[PDB]
Design a protein around this ligand. Structure first.
Ligand code: K
Ligand code: K
Ligand code: K
Ligand code: K
Ligand code: K
Ligand code: K
Ligand code: K
Ligand code: K
Ligand code: K
Ligand code: K
Ligand code: K
Ligand code: K
Ligand code: K
Ligand code: K
Ligand code: K
Ligand code: K
Ligand code: K
Ligand code: K
Ligand code: K
Ligand code: K
Ligand code: K
Ligand code: K
Ligand code: K
Ligand code: K
Ligand code: K
Ligand code: K
Ligand code: K
Ligand code: K
Ligand code: K
Ligand code: K
Ligand code: K
Ligand code: K
Ligand code: K
Ligand code: MG
Ligand code: MG
Ligand code: MG
Ligand code: MG
Ligand code: MG
Ligand code: MG
Ligand code: MG
Ligand code: MG
Ligand code: MG
Ligand code: MG
Ligand code: MG
Ligand code: MG
Ligand code: MG
Ligand code: MG
Ligand code: MG
Ligand code: MG
Ligand code: MG
Ligand code: MG
Ligand code: MG
Ligand code: MG
Ligand code: MG
Ligand code: MG
Ligand code: MG
Ligand code: MG
Ligand code: MG
Ligand code: MG
Ligand code: MG
Ligand code: MG
Ligand code: MG
Ligand code: MG
Ligand code: MG
Ligand code: MG
Ligand code: MG
Ligand code: MG
Ligand code: MG
Ligand code: MG
Ligand code: MG
Ligand code: MG
Ligand code: MG
Ligand code: MG
Ligand code: MG
Ligand code: MG
Ligand code: MG
Ligand code: MG
Ligand code: MG
Ligand code: MG
Ligand code: MG
Ligand code: MG
Ligand code: MG
Ligand code: MG
Ligand code: MG
Ligand code: MG
Ligand code: MG
Ligand code: MG
Ligand code: MG
Ligand code: MG
Ligand code: MG
Ligand code: MG
Ligand code: MG
Ligand code: MG
Ligand code: MG
Ligand code: MG
Ligand code: MG
Ligand code: MG
Ligand code: MG
Ligand code: MG
Ligand code: MG
Ligand code: MG
Ligand code: MG
Ligand code: MG
Ligand code: MG
Ligand code: MG
Ligand code: MG
Ligand code: MG
Ligand code: MG
Ligand code: MG
Ligand code: MG
Ligand code: MG
Ligand code: MG
Ligand code: MG
Ligand code: MG
Ligand code: MG
Ligand code: MG
Ligand code: MG
Ligand code: MG
Ligand code: MG
Ligand code: MG
Ligand code: MG
Ligand code: MG
Ligand code: MG
Ligand code: MG
Lengths: 147, 210
RNA sequence: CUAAUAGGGAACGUGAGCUGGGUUUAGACCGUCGUGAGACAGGUUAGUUUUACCCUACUGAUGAUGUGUUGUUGCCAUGGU
RNA sequence: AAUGCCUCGUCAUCUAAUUAGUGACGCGCAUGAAGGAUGAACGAGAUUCCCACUGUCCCUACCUACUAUCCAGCGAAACCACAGCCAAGGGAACGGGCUUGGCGGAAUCAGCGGGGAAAGAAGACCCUGUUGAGCUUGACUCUAGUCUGGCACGGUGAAG
RNA sequence: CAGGGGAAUCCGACUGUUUAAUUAAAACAAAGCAUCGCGAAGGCCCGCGGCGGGUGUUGACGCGAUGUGAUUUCUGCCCA
RNA sequence: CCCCGCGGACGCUACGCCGCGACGAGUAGGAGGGCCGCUGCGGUGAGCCUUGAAGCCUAGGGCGCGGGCCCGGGUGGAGCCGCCGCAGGUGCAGAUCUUGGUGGUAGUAGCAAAUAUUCAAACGAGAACUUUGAAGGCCGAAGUGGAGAAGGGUUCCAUGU
RNA sequence: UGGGCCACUUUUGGUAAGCAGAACUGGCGCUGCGGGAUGAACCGAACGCCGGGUUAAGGCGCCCGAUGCCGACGCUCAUCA
RNA sequence: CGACCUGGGUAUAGGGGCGAAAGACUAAUCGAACCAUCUAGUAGCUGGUUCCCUCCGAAGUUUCCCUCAGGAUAGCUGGC
RNA sequence: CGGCGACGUCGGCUACCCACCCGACCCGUCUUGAAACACGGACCAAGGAGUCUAACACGUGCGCGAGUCGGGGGCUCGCACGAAAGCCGCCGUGGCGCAAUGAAGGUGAAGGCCGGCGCGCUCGCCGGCCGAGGUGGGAUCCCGAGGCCUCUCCAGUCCGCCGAGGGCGCACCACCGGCCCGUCUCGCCCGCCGCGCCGGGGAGGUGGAGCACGAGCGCACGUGUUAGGACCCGAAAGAUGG
RNA sequence: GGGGACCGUCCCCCGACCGGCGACCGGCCGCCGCCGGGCGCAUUUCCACCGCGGCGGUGCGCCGCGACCGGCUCCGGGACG
RNA sequence: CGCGACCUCAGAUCAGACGUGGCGACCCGCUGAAUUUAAGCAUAUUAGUCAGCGGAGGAGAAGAAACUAACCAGGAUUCCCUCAGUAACGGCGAGUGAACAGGGAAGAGCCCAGCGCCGAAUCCCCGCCCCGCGGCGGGGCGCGGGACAUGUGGCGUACGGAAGACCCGCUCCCCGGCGCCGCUCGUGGGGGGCCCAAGUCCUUCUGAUCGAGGCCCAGCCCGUGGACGGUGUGAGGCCGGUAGCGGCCCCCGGCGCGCCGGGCCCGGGUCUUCCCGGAGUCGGGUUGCUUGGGAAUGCAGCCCAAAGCGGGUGGUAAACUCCAUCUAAGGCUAAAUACCGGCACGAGACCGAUAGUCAACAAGUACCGUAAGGGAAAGUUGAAAAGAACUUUGAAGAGAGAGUUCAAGAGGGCGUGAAACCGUUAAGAGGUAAACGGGUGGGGUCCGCGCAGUCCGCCCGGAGGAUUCAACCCGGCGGCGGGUCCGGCCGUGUCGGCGGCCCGGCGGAUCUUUCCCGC
């Protein structure tokens, strides 16, 4: 809505808010990111450190699919199965532990942030972090790898 | 000019963009026009499925999608051979065939041939001359059961095997998943250089005594 | 020559007053400088000087206000000198 | 000297008087040899003097034609914040307006060139612009054309 | 109808030409003088290109490129 | 334990109403409010209107700090407005602004290059300028004469206005 | 916004400057009002629309509000006060 | 009477022509014609920038910049 | 409490003309400074200049919320409106968020207390519990001795208010610890189908746009910056083709 | 591949207790109120007129005057320490 | 030294055909800047863009891998979403910048050369006859010509192919008509023509009315039609239309059946024996350009110049090695996609005569320039011309009367008719240019139903009317309360689950035939 903007309030005011002395001129200071190493150096250094220069090795023909490895933490691990699955295992008399296939849920690597409920579980993943494996074995579970 | 904190922006509007702008005011009209063509095509092939030929079961290529199965271009010639369908007859009865697809594994080959055999059973074939049926189908079921199928023929369906909760064995509990992955990466990384060093030691052993 | 040939101001008074000799465009010559284009409070020669009918100022010319109209003869405030 | 700053150089001549002219001199700021130095004829070329001539002047006057002027008819434009009497003051340091004073009398005509820092043109001088253009050059970077080497078209025989 | 004249200095020899619309000149041109390139598979020049084109329907007493500027008289030294 | 009285103002769009205290300059600039204003759209006003819409004019009556608004009178002759939302090509004194129109200047400058006109008559409402006659002059054959090229294109010729 | 300027005092260059350059506070710029005749900066005082009272700085012959007090004490005559 | 004047027909076209040379002329345009387009070219520079009331209210300083008529930056401001 | 009221008067500070006193220079603009002898403006009418797209940032409103979002497609008599609206859920592919760190190979965020033991060697095997530590502040909330009452007292029956002290402490802030990735220094252990130039672990500093019981996503609006003709008008120029 | 079992949400019912009839409604009662029709037909009630009537409110068509009270202010007398 | 065959050339107004030029919005092939940004500027950017040249079609181009990948693999082209402002390029500055995978729209595949076999099996032209005409085809005939072994046709093309045997299946194609369907289709398939509801009812407004009231029976009439336009207003019913799987008529096209004219001629599986490919091309060097392509993405020039268990690709140059993947240097192909030009339509929160196209109108017109080219201004009487008869002054323009009209205070550039500016009338004023702010005063035009100046509540008094005032009776309707008095309830639990995978659903990453269909 143009009726809600400053232009409707700047009618009758000669400089339209831009000022009498400095005026409103086309491009004082340059166009775009002009003078980032010259007359705009302080802004670029103050707010965008690292902007200028090369770092690291380039890699031609990067294929993002090859590096595809979504991760899930242990605190969210039991959300990949139904609530029926986890209550049944807890009240199960035997040592039967449910299987959580994180690849089926869309994750490849299991990370170890958080803590697990005290009940065994079999976790199937492409990759495991060291601490995720340790926490799964602490609750009596097992980690088995898939390809 | 930069003003305080902000994101260094690089708009790509230096190239006279206003002369090549694609508006979408014909999008509602385009959706109507394609839908008329879809309906007209379905009427033209009256009993044949509206979507078209049956397509094969296909696993997606890369490591991002290789857990997912989709529909492919056409059944392979190897798939048709063990299904007993001529590669020139199949296209006349609604089987799409891709001459340039090979079957690297038997499971993919064997899954697609059950798709073909099962589709062959579901197929109702009208005789070329309705008065004289040679080997088409019985008129009892080709009359009443003949209906234009809507949607893809036998839609490709991602099936998940449900794993039964079981007791964890001690062997499973003793497996070191993280150590195995770290050792496997090292073994694959140093396989070539280990063979060279073993070879260079072998050349030292064949001449250790002189 | 004369009594004397005093010094100055007025947008270094005064160019819709003039003139255009000088400076200070474009042509050209000389000297010096510069590789050169070219330069020179150096010299020289040739080089368009536009408009007032407006307001005021001033100069003159009719008139205007008050004594009823109109005329003759007069006075002198003031200004110039 | 169309070339000399000093310089109105010095001497002579021309005049009553000459920063002018001519003649002469020359340590010539900074003359000079394809251009130097002369020399008739010629020149809408620059300069000095003389005779004659004259309103150039003393020193202005008179006359003629066409205007201007007045009238009948016809009939623009430039320009215009508002306007239009001065002295001083202060003020963007030169006012028509403001302050203090002088004062101020309708509507006009022919003139006039003091003012309106009059009009005409977004100063051409000067400076600035990370604005040009014409031209020049061992400025930077190139380039047509040219000179040279190589490969191909590109062959057949001999002396080496 | 229809030249004022004379004595000189400077520049340009002369006649000619020139900035239409501020400069007619001492400027340009000029004849004369000097130098340079070239014998044609060439000199100079045009051309995006063709063994294209101009000089050239030409051939050194000719074409092309410069400087100086009639006549007279001279034109000195320096190739770092 | 109201009752001879059966009764007792207003209020409180709560985005409303009421009380008390202090305070009030403003360029550049920022913000808020606008029942300020323009045009169009969705709703709404059982809205207005040929028994007179819009627009315009007005020594008419008023309202608001103001932007503005309402009403009377006239003209006009077919449409228009309020409120809740929505959306803008939405508000002018300037830009040597654009287009159009109009002033002062001003009945002014001016209608002054090439010697020159005059008398009578005719037609005609009307004659300095037309026509005829008379007279005085000019071009003076390198013409203000007689014919062509280029260019123009009907300007040629009659009659009429 | 990133042209500042002015005044008391301190202060550098300069003969000096309504010059140029600093320090400190205030001001003008952005600010009207009373007074200084007049005036960006001085003195008083800062401002919604008004009535009454009183002041500031400055004034009270007349212009022009207020001494039209029987004001006090002296000084001073200028033919540029 | 001549490097004379002139009509018509031809040829040379824009970084090109033509020039007895003045940067002259090339359709009132020439130290690079005219027409259309790229093009609403860019401008740290000049000019303008349209209703009301209420509240708050500056800076011409720091640092860096081919920076000195401009920006970035801190400061001063407003709003939430 | 008084006077006066219809063809002459009564009231109307507004509005029309005139008079007088006081005050009062022409606006706009640049500027330290304009009434300026600084520029633009003779007059009137109509037109006339911060817009739209995209991308960010922050603030605000709305829905859902560790999710969120169908915008591309498809299904619905194919169409007055309707080019709308509705629906999809094996259309959520995908985007953004839910994990960071390193150039990279890669790695990748849980601690506290109670016990027996090696030697509770700054320490390794377990048990049990609780589930992101602690200090100082911290709105709010909780307990609360003692008070405040009645026509009066020996004696409690029900709750209300004030209340010194004490307690649990939100968000947030300061600080101290802890955890993840990079990199240094020191050092000792552990694992095996590959006994390796293999793999893992510790302590102490330090680099990170991290963790430490999520806050995001979509839509709308406003402001600011930027690329676009970019608030409007304005060159001297350059290029292409005639 | 089906078909089953189980679990989670549901469903309409067969039934009781629980809080209430609620802003989800009806029937009965009780109280109250209103309306219509009778009765009541006049010391009641209601309607309109008159008084230059009284009490209240608002306000006087215009132009004026006075009085006391209170707030602010400028002055003047008298007396006491 | 002649005549023949062939080869390579030439002429013809030879017989019969074809191309040229235009448009050019979209598309294909080239060529190709500079302004601009970088706060200067040269690489870069602008941009493979403007301008320039060529060539097409209703689309074009592309296109069935010398591909993508590195996976558990996908599988022609084109378009959309995303990948992604990412990998990468870049005075690594300003800036630039894809692809694969994934999800969709659409979906379609094929043909030669070569290698071989088949008595050239092949093709064009010319005469004759028949069936036809409707773009000129079919059949038969010709000791009729020509092309062609310097290679036509059939089979066949990497997905392998061919030929022989053995076995099995006889299985059935495409073309033009005769008559008729289903009537072609979301209810016609398309094109054209002509038609189809209901007030001009009563009273009134007006110049005119389409306006305003009314139209008993639940209401004037129709409504599958209340879109729109016209008509003297403003109309669902006055008219044209509008709605309708409404009617009639005319013309044209592909769809099934029986027949006709002719073609029409073996397909699959196993085994055996054979056969298998595109060269001044690839590739390499170099140069220039181009790209995100970076020790060089693509394109081109020049030089070099291949191979056949070969060649290409595998995003860092090179050697060795394994592996993966495709098979270049020949060709065709619909759909999804594009469309500021054209034909014909529909619509709009757009503009409303200085706006919107330059152009609402005799507009690319008038006009300007030698030319290239530049390029306006300009809408409105009235319902109807009913466009002012006639009289009178004047030479006429122009007037005064008269007349039409609702209105000419609408009179042919005529709706309305502002401001600037001007004329006249009226009022007021006038020597400090006007104009302005504050304060009064005077005059004037108007306003105030101004002109004897409020209203109304109660009570008192006077003089009159009317019922009926209260209280009781009957009926109706409301408000409030009631152990639920009685229901119907509702919220929360509470049990048998009688109740559902037959006699109720939807889900679950929960368990199973140990009763049932594929290894
Ligand atoms: K602003
Ligand atoms: K005197
Ligand atoms: K000589
Ligand atoms: K001469
Ligand atoms: K130039
Ligand atoms: K001569
Ligand atoms: K001459
Ligand atoms: K030659
Ligand atoms: K020479
Ligand atoms: K030499
Ligand atoms: K030499
Ligand atoms: K409305
Ligand atoms: K108002
Ligand atoms: K009106
Ligand atoms: K700032
Ligand atoms: K700044
Ligand atoms: K001639
Ligand atoms: K040029
Ligand atoms: K400076
Ligand atoms: K001015
Ligand atoms: K969608
Ligand atoms: K998601
Ligand atoms: K990573
Ligand atoms: K912008
Ligand atoms: K042209
Ligand atoms: K990037
Ligand atoms: K043959
Ligand atoms: K009809
Ligand atoms: K190459
Ligand atoms: K290979
Ligand atoms: K136009
Ligand atoms: K046109
Ligand atoms: K009219
Ligand atoms: Mg302001
Ligand atoms: Mg303005
Ligand atoms: Mg401005
Ligand atoms: Mg002077
Ligand atoms: Mg002069
Ligand atoms: Mg003068
Ligand atoms: Mg002179
Ligand atoms: Mg000169
Ligand atoms: Mg020299
Ligand atoms: Mg001299
Ligand atoms: Mg001269
Ligand atoms: Mg005159
Ligand atoms: Mg006297
Ligand atoms: Mg001498
Ligand atoms: Mg003399
Ligand atoms: Mg010599
Ligand atoms: Mg004066
Ligand atoms: Mg003046
Ligand atoms: Mg200037
Ligand atoms: Mg200029
Ligand atoms: Mg600068
Ligand atoms: Mg330049
Ligand atoms: Mg050099
Ligand atoms: Mg001469
Ligand atoms: Mg000579
Ligand atoms: Mg001449
Ligand atoms: Mg001249
Ligand atoms: Mg001359
Ligand atoms: Mg000589
Ligand atoms: Mg010569
Ligand atoms: Mg204020
Ligand atoms: Mg606008
Ligand atoms: Mg205006
Ligand atoms: Mg005159
Ligand atoms: Mg005259
Ligand atoms: Mg004569
Ligand atoms: Mg003649
Ligand atoms: Mg004639
Ligand atoms: Mg500045
Ligand atoms: Mg400064
Ligand atoms: Mg100073
Ligand atoms: Mg200064
Ligand atoms: Mg300022
Ligand atoms: Mg201030
Ligand atoms: Mg002040
Ligand atoms: Mg004052
Ligand atoms: Mg003074
Ligand atoms: Mg006062
Ligand atoms: Mg005084
Ligand atoms: Mg006085
Ligand atoms: Mg612009
Ligand atoms: Mg421009
Ligand atoms: Mg620098
Ligand atoms: Mg400036
Ligand atoms: Mg200015
Ligand atoms: Mg100044
Ligand atoms: Mg000013
Ligand atoms: Mg001044
Ligand atoms: Mg200026
Ligand atoms: Mg103007
Ligand atoms: Mg002017
Ligand atoms: Mg306007
Ligand atoms: Mg939709
Ligand atoms: Mg996903
Ligand atoms: Mg805490
Ligand atoms: Mg810490
Ligand atoms: Mg920001
Ligand atoms: Mg340039
Ligand atoms: Mg630049
Ligand atoms: Mg710039
Ligand atoms: Mg530049
Ligand atoms: Mg183009
Ligand atoms: Mg063509
Ligand atoms: Mg094609
Ligand atoms: Mg193709
Ligand atoms: Mg192929
Ligand atoms: Mg992304
Ligand atoms: Mg590019
Ligand atoms: Mg599809
Ligand atoms: Mg063959
Ligand atoms: Mg009809
Ligand atoms: Mg109508
Ligand atoms: Mg109608
Ligand atoms: Mg119909
Ligand atoms: Mg590599
Ligand atoms: Mg127009
Ligand atoms: Mg109009
Ligand atoms: Mg006339
Ligand atoms: Mg009328
Ligand atoms: Mg009219
Ligand atoms: Mg008048």
């Amino acid at each position: 809505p143009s009726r809600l903007r400053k232009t409707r309030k700047l009618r009758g005011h000669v400089s339209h808010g831009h000022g009498r002395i400095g005026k409103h001129r086309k491009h004082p200071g340059g166009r775009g990111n002009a003078g980032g190493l010259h007359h705009h150096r302080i802004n670029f250094d103050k707010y965008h450190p690292g902007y200028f220069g090369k770092v690291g090795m380039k890699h031609y023909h990067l294929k993002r699919n090859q590096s595809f490895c979504p991760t899930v933490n242990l605190d969210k691990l039991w959300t990949l199965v139904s609530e029926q699955t986890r209550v049944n295992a807890a009240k199960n008399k035997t040592g039967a532990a449910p299987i959580i296939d994180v690849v089926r849920s869309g994750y490849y690597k299991v990370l170890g942030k958080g803590k697990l409920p005290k009940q065994p579980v079999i976790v199937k993943a492409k990759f495991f972090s060291r601490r995720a494996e340790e926490k799964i074995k602490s609750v009596g579970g097992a980690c088995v790898l898939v390809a | 000019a930069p003003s305080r904190n902000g994101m260094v922006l690089k708009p790509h509007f230096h190239k006279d963009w206003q002369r090549r702008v694609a508006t979408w005011f014909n999008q509602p009209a385009r959706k109507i026009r394609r839908r008329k063509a879809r309906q007209a095509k379905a009427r033209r092939i009256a009993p044949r499925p509206a979507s078209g030929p049956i397509r094969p079961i296909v696993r997606c290529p890369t490591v991002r999608y290789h857990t997912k199965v989709r529909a492919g271009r056409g059944f392979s010639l190897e798939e048709l051979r063990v299904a007993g369908i001529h590669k020139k007859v199949a296209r006349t009865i609604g089987i799409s065939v891709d001459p340039r697809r090979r079957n690297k594994s038997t499971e993919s080959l064997q899954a697609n041939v059950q798709r073909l055999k099962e589709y062959r059973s579901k197929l109702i074939l009208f005789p070329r001359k309705p008065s004289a049926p040679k080997k088409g189908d019985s008129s009892a079921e080709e009359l009443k059961l003949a209906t234009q199928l809507t949607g893809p023929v036998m839609p490709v369906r991602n099936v998940y095997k449900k794993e039964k909760a079981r007791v964890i064995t001690e062997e499973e509990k003793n497996f070191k998943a993280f150590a195995s992955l770290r050792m496997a990466r090292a073994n694959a990384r140093l396989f070539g250089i280990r063979a060279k060093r073993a070879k260079e030691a072998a050349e030292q052993d064949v001449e250790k005594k002189k």
